[PDB]
């Protein structure tokens, strides 16, 4: 007896996403500590990019963040390569 109405629980990124990411990168085994760590890192990345993006948006005097604002922010983030040019 007694039926319960469900509440939307999407908050943050759950464990399988982190496993999926790690597998993409060739990782075969992870400490449990990896989960929280990855969340922390993603959060910082997003915090930086978004900040810059919103600033672009503020300078256009609009309330809508466009794709281009993001592109520019990402350009600010820095690009990593696995070898040298030339």
């Amino acid at each position: 007896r007694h039926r319960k109405v469900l509440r939307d629980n999407i908050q943050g990124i759950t464990k399988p996403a982190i496993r999926r990411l790690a597998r993409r990168g060739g990782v075969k085994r992870i400490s449990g500590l990896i989960y929280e760590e990855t969340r922390g890192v993603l959060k910082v990345f997003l915090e930086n990019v978004i900040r810059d993006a919103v600033t672009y948006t503020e300078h256009a005097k609009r309330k809508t963040v466009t794709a281009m604002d993001v592109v520019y922010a990402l350009k600010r983030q820095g690009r990593t390569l696995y070898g040298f040019g030339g």
Partner: protein, 57 residues
Amino acid sequence: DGEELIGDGMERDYRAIPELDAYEAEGLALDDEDVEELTASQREAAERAMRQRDREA
């Protein structure tokens, strides 16, 4: 002392869940509002604002 990623059973991580796999409309601009781009005067102004912030920070 870790967790094996492979993974007999790893298939469980790859299920499609359309409810979670689609963006929703809330918070999104659809389909007409101000998208107008940054130009230059506003752009370089922003990059200066942020560079100076990253000085102060």
